[PDB]
Amino acid sequence: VFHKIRNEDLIFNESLGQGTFTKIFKGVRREVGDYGQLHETEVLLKVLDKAHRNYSESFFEAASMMSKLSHKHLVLNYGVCVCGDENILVQEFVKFGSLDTYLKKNKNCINILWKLEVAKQLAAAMHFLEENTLIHGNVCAKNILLIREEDRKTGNPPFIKLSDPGISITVLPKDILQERIPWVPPECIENPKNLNLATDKWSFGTTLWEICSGGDKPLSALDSQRKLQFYEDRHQLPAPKAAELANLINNCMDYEPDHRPSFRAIIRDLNSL
Numbered sequence: 001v002f003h004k005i006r007n008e009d010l011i012f013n014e015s016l017g018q019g020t021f022t023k024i025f026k027g028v029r030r031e032v033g034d035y036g037q038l039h040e041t042e043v044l045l046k047v048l049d050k051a052h053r054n055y056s057e058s059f060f061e062a063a064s065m066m067s068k069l070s071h072k073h074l075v076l077n078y079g080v081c082v083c084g085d086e087n088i089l090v091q092e093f094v095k096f097g098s099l100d101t102y103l104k105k106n107k108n109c110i111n112i113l114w115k116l117e118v119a120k121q122l123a124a125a126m127h128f129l130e131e132n133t134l135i136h137g138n139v140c141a142k143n144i145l146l147i148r149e150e151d152r153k154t155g156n157p158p159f160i161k162l163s164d165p166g167i168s169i170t171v172l173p174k175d176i177l178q179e180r181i182p183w184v185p186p187e188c189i190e191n192p193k194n195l196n197l198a199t200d201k202w203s204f205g206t207t208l209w210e211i212c213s214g215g216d217k218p219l220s221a222l223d224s225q226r227k228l229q230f231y232e233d234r235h236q237l238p239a240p241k242a243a244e245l246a247n248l249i250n251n252c253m254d255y256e257p258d259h260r261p262s263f264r265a266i267i268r269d270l271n272s273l
């Protein structure tokens with residue numbers, strides 16, 4: 001279970017965007033830290049919409065299991081605030097935000113080595129989850145956070161963390177799942193209860209495509225009906241302009257879930273490049 005944080009110890013500041021049935025804010029948490037020192041800590045406040053409070057269990061189940069495992073590439077959740085009529089997840093504040101936005105704003109200076117390094121880090125996080133048989137369920141660039149930028153001057157690579165998946169696709173309305181094609185894999189469009197470790201391998205491929213496409217959203221030009229037919233006709237995504245990872249993307253986005261490669265094999269493939 002999560003640590004409970006009092007509403008009185010939280011300050012809400014600027015909106016940082018939205019997720020499915022959620023709103024995201026920068027905030028501050030007043031707390032007693034190590035050695036009894038008082039801190040005012042920057043936090044990320046993720047607020048479930050009041051009109052959708054019936055999703056609260058799924059909303060928190062998302063963060064909870066992951067938070068039971070500690071890992072350098074997994075986002076740190078501090079706790080929850082459920083004072084009053086609020087359902088709030090309190091998470092570490094990451095300096096450079098989510099990867100979808102970062103890729104869009106920085107595509108003109110993100111090269112193949114940056115992408116490869118980010119791909120390796122995401123794959124390491126997914127390998128850790130796979131070895132713990134823990135399904136994420138919503139791997140996408142919007143759920144990757146950039147802790148540290150690349151610094152060629154000190155040879156330092158960028159550093160990312162995988163964030164929580166949000167409300168599960170197993171409880172979400174069908175139209176939202178359809179709009180999430182091609183992150184949601186075909187077997188889960190057919191039946192959301194098919195959610196499996198193999199799900200994350202497909203979504204990881206879609207996420208690599210995002211990383212390689214400067215923040216473009218694959219199939220964004222297709223409405224929901226056409227995204228459905230894309231799966232019915234068994235199409236693959238087009239290779240990104242910088243196509244170094246295209247074979248890996250397509251191997252991960254295998255319409256046969258049992259044929260998708262282990263994250264160990266994915267990592268060995270990345271290391272070959």
Ligand SMILES: N#Cc1ccc(Nc2nc(N)cc(-n3cnc(CCO)c3)n2)cc1
Pocket residue numbers: 016017018019024044091092093094095096097098142143144145163
């Ligand atoms: N300009 C700007 C700027 C924006 C955001 C941050 N920091 C931050 N920290 C987090 N822990 C999570 C997020 N975040 C943002 N969008 C999502 C979507 C769901 O993943 C998550 N952003 C820092 C700078």
